[PDB]
């Protein structure tokens, strides 16, 4: 049986403030820039539709230097931090970014048509761009988040598999890391393994996995450590309706239509796909630059940061403007030529985080020791995530008890 | 005279929690995939615009194993379950799906025109796609739902009927089953019997019946067993305005126009039809992933699940993204060819259900026995739906009295 943390955790009246100064990231919005001979990255990939996972490290309160010590007994008490307030400051102006493919697989525009496509070609690919759906989300926890996507499965060995067959599909749960791609209006699938022509989705997702958070599995966890708080807001609509070009994997049944003649002797493509569009960004619909108070979590864990560790996941596509840069090769010409200038694309992104923490103490009795050991063995030993990449935040040297000297501390003292 | 269940049913203070783990369905969005020689289905049809009817089976509380028994007298008491809270968890990201026909009967675009169509052809069919209207609905009851549609009637035998005559129309009430089609913006009619050219509506409804729930008949039922609770939300608008091609069944009267000459010697088609469009999906307009509390039903039945049976009907077109898959036939070519790849379409859909139930007891006196026998004869015998198809849910082995160990039980205990 799982019990709430409010039973075996005692909260004191000591509060601390923590915060980062400013985080910046500048890079190419579509692909990394790499040296031709080498494999070392010169310009990383920074996009507005990437998961931002911050892993925050806290001081050990047992070894922390407090002006007063009489409030607890080190012989039978142990200390831990609790989160009571978070703000995610978000710079840059509001904007919308677009992406596309120079060789995207589009056959025809089927929204309105007046002639029939009676002849097939060798290459019908086009240069198409669009803007993605609108999404904001924030997740806070003490364990890394969990996402889901569609991937290939293991086929049965009863019958053989011929080239060109439909791959089998299964649903896969993984851990979201820093730099992953969010859904853009095409689904949560592995585009590298489920698409072979490399020309069906834009350039920044054509060789990546799009993942969606697994809210149902996260909230059903018995201990509720992976999610203390979450906000989400997403929207989209359809702008264009197209076809796809290729060979027909599955034929239309003969009892759904009447055969034609002349131009309509053969059938056109039935692999319709839409073009997504986020509508419009406004200041009134923003979930950032606002303080969140963590009064009572939904799960049994109520903001206790076991292991001196915090995880913050952020997605915000409402500031995704890409900047165009131009450099002149030769300036000794008074008439414009296309070949005298070079074009570049850049994206910059700005972050700020600030937190209010409360000090708690735990009495280690035999029953409490047994329960905590059953919950997590490493906690007692201290008194794994080495193959994942997160944005590391080190707050071991940024705490202050002067709570009213900071913007978030003033609000915290004002609400109470 | 019909009396409320609150008079002859006594409620105890015992609550139980039930829930399914996860339900998945993957298939083709338009038609089933079948072997050519055989008639057995390989890939079923899974679409975002299908009725989902879950038939849920509960344990018999008379034979159920309770830790305590003294709260009722088996010599004169009988037990039954009552529903007090339901949540329908809904996975996958928000999206919009589209559908169309490769040989759809469209003549001209009449929104804006500059030339007159003075010549008729043999085949003027086009490849047209669109996106449907937006609809969400949830219905809960203890009997299967009832729907209505337009169908053919029996003509009078006074005069003969010639080929090409207009079929007679009547309104027909039936039972909604799992896999039926919801209205998409073209009406609630039988497209198989009322349309003969097979080219007027897209491929996933051209040989199906679209049904609409019969709310007026459901709420007028004397006992109110078919509907305890319901939510609905639908919206659409018009994108395109077209004509139809064919022979004219009914001529325009000569007193509504002045005859033309030259290009306008004959009249163009007056069988105008619009193209529907659901507008836009947002997180703020969602009715799912929210708990429903059944405090007081509208009808006389107040959540009592007679016969240990429940029915849940769900429609949700706000997650209807179709995934495109591509398979390579030969990989020994460095230049792209259309004939070297095969294209497929898939749709996957995810469900979760969770319920809170209360235990009730009934005293069987002579008047109560007579009333219940008049209401339903099978109830006394226990102390029909074999020709319908539902998604069967078996909760006979998933109850637990530990109510706070689950996400919905925590909310239930929090609200009270």
């Amino acid at each position, epitope marked *: 049986k799982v019990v709430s943390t409010d039973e075996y955790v005692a909260r004191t009246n000591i509060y601390y403030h923590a915060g980062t100064s400013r985080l910046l990231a500048v890079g190419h919005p579509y692909f990394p820039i790499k040296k031709p001979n080498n494999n070392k990255i010169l310009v990383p990939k920074v996009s507005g539709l990437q998961y931002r996972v911050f892993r925050i490290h806290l001081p050990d309160p047992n070894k922390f230097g407090f002006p007063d010590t009489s409030f607890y007994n080190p012989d039978t008490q142990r200390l831990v931090w609790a989160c009571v307030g978070v703000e995610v400051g978000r710079g840059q102006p509001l904007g919308v970014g677009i992406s596309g493919h120079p060789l995207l697989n589009k056959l025809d525009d089927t929204e309105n048509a007046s002639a029939y496509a009676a002849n097939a070609g060798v290459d019908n690919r086009e240069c198409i761009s669009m803007d993605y759906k609108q999404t904001q989300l924030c997740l806070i926890g003490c364990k890394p988040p969990i996402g889901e996507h569609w991937g290939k499965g293991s086929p049965c060995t009863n019958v053989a598999v011929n080239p060109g067959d439909c791959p089998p599909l299964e649903l896969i749960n993984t851990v979201i890391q820093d730099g992953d791609m969010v859904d853009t209006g095409f689904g949560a699938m592995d585009f590298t393994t489920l698409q072979a022509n490399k020309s069906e989705v834009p350039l920044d997702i054509c060789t990546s996995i799009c993942k969606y958070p697994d809210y149902i599995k996260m909230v059903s966890e018995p201990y509720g450590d992976s999610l203390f708080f979450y906000l989400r807001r997403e929207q989209m609509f359809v702008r264009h309706l197209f076809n796809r070009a290729g060979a*027909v994997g599955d*034929n*239309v049944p003969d009892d759904l239509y009447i*055969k034609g003649s002349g131009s309509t002797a*053969n*059938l*056109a493509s039935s692999n319709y796909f839409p073009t997504p569009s986020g509508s419009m960004v406004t200041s009134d619909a923003q979930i950032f630059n606002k303080p969140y108070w963590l009064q009572r979590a939904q799960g049994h864990n109520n903001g206790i940061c076991w292991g001196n560790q915090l995880f913050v996941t952020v997605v915000d596509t409402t500031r995704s403007t890409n900047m165009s840069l131009c450099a002149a090769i030769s300036t000794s010409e008074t008439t414009y030529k296309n070949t005298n200038f070079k074009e570049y694309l850049r994206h910059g992104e700005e972050y700020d985080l600030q937190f209010i923490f409360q000090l708690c103490k735990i009495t280690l009795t035999a029953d409490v020791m047994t329960y905590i050991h059953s919950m997590n063995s490493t906690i007692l030993e201290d008194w794994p995530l080495k193959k994942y990449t997160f944005w590391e935040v080190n707050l071991k040297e940024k705490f202050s008890a002067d709570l009213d000297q900071f913007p978030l501390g003033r609000k915290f003292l004002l609400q109470a | 005279k019909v009396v409320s269940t609150d008079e002859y049913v006594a409620r105890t203070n015992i609550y139980y929690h039930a829930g399914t783990s996860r339900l998945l369905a993957v298939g083709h969005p338009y038609f089933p995939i079948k072997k050519p020689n055989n008639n057995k289905i390989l890939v079923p049809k899974v679409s975002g615009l299908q009725y989902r009817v879950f038939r849920i089976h509960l344990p018999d509380p008379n034979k159920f194993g309770f830790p305590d028994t003294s709260f009722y007298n088996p010599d004169t008491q009988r037990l039954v379950w009552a529903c007090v809270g339901v949540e329908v968890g809904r996975g996958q990201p928000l999206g919009v799906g589209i559908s169309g026909h490769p040989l759809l009967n469209k003549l001209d675009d009449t929104e804006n025109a500059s030339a007159y169509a003075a010549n008729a052809g043999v085949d003027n069919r086009e490849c047209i796609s669109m996106d449907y209207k937006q609809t969400q609905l949830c219905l809960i009851g203890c009997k299967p739902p009832i729907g209505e549609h337009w169908g053919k009637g029996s003509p009078c035998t006074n005069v003969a009927v010639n080929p090409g005559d207009c079929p007679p129309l009547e309104l027909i009430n039936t039972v909604i089953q799992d896999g039926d089609m919801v209205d998409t913006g073209f009406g609630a009619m039988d497209f198989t019997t009322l349309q003969a050219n097979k080219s007027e509506v897209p491929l996933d409804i051209c040989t199906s019946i679209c049904k609409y729930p019969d709310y007026i008949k459901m709420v007028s039922e004397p006992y109110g067993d078919s509907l305890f609770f319901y939510l609905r939300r639908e919206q659409m608008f018009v994108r395109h305005l077209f004509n139809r091609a064919g022979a004219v069944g009914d001529n325009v009267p000569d007193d509504l126009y002045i005859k033309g000459s030259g290009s306008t010697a004959n009249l163009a088609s007056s069988n105008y039809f619009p193209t529907p469009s659901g507008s836009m999906v947002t997180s703020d307009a969602q009715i799912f992933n929210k708990p429903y509390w059944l405090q007081r039903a509208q009808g006389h039945n107040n959540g009592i699940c007679w016969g240990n049976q429940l029915f849940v009907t769900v429609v949700d077109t706000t997650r209807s993204t179709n995934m495109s898959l591509c398979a390579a*036939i*030969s990989t020994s070519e460095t230049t792209y060819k259309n*004939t070297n790849f095969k294209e497929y379409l898939r749709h996957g859909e995810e469900y979760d259900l969770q319920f809170i139930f209360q235990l009730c007891k009934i005293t069987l006196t002579a008047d109560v026995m007579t009333y219940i026998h008049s209401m339903n004869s099978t109830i006394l015998e226990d102390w029909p739906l074999k020709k319908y198809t539902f998604w069967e849910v078996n909760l006979k082995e998933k109850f637990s009295a530990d109510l706070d160990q689950f996400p919905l039980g925590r909310k239930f205990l929090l609200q009270a």
Partner: antibody
Framework: QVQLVQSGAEVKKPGSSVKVSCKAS????????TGWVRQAPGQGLEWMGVIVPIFGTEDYPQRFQGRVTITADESTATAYMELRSLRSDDTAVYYC???????????????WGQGTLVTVSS | DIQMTQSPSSLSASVGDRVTITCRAS??????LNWYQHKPGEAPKLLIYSASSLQTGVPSRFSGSGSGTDFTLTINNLQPEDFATYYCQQSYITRLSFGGGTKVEIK
């Protein structure tokens, strides 16, 4: 240029099934539409079936439905024709006709096989 | 399907003459007609497609014309290598069909 090569002569008994192949040898083909024709002793030409893998087309004449199957393999660029329930009137010479992608229509059958003799007798 | 009738079924000509063959369709098939030449011991060979267009590598002495239900093939200045069997073919529907065939012989 490209040449289509067919399999050898076949001798079958009534009630059996036969299968004939058609392979493109020179260059790279990238076939467009495949069809089969036959000629009986002392008769004309008879169309027996067409497949167009793009557009997903597969059509046979009414007198031949249920007994004829036409298949194409793009990895090896080989066409196959299957006849079931052979009769004594199926003794004939069979021709493979194919069209190449990049032409102006699907019915520009400019490539033909040499023909295969099939004799159904006991 | 569509039935096609080819006339005549046989004719004799001399070197340097003009030969015309008429072809008739059971329905309107626009210009979806092709003409094939067949010699003994060889495969059929395409000459005219779409009832007017001339295949590459074919002498200009061959011509074809027609539309609707009536079509015709003309050969001017007959040469010794032109003596073969000629067939119609409709491609209006995906269920193609051939004509009866006309055999040209030596006078």
């Amino acid at each position: 240029q490209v040449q289509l090569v067919q399999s050898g002569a076949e001798v079958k008994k009534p009630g059996s099934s036969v299968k004939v192949s058609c392979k493109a040898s020179g260059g790279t083909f990238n076939s467009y539409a495949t069809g089969w024709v036959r000629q009986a002793p002392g008769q004309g030409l008879e169309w027996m079936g067409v497949i167009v893998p793009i557009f997903g087309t597969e059509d046979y004449p009414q007198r031949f439905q249920g007994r004829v199957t036409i298949t194409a393999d793009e990895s090896t660029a080989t066409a196959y024709m299957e006849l079931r329930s052979l009769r004594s009137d199926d003794t004939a010479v069979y021709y493979c006709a194919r069209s190449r992608l990049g032409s102006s229509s699907w019915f520009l059958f400019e490539y033909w096989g040499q023909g295969t003799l099939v004799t159904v007798s006991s | 399907d569509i039935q096609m009738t080819q006339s005549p079924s046989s004719l004799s000509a001399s070197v340097g003459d003009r030969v015309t063959i008429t072809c008739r369709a059971s329905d309107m098939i626009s210009n979806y007609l092709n003409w094939y030449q067949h010699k003994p011991g060889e495969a059929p060979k395409l000459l005219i497609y779409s009832a007017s267009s001339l295949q590459t590598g074919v002498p200009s002495r061959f011509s074809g014309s027609g539309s609707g239900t009536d079509f015709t093939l003309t050969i001017n200045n007959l040469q010794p290598e032109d003596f073969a069997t000629y067939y119609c073919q409709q491609s209006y529907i995906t269920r193609l069909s051939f004509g009866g065939g006309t055999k040209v012989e030596i006078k």
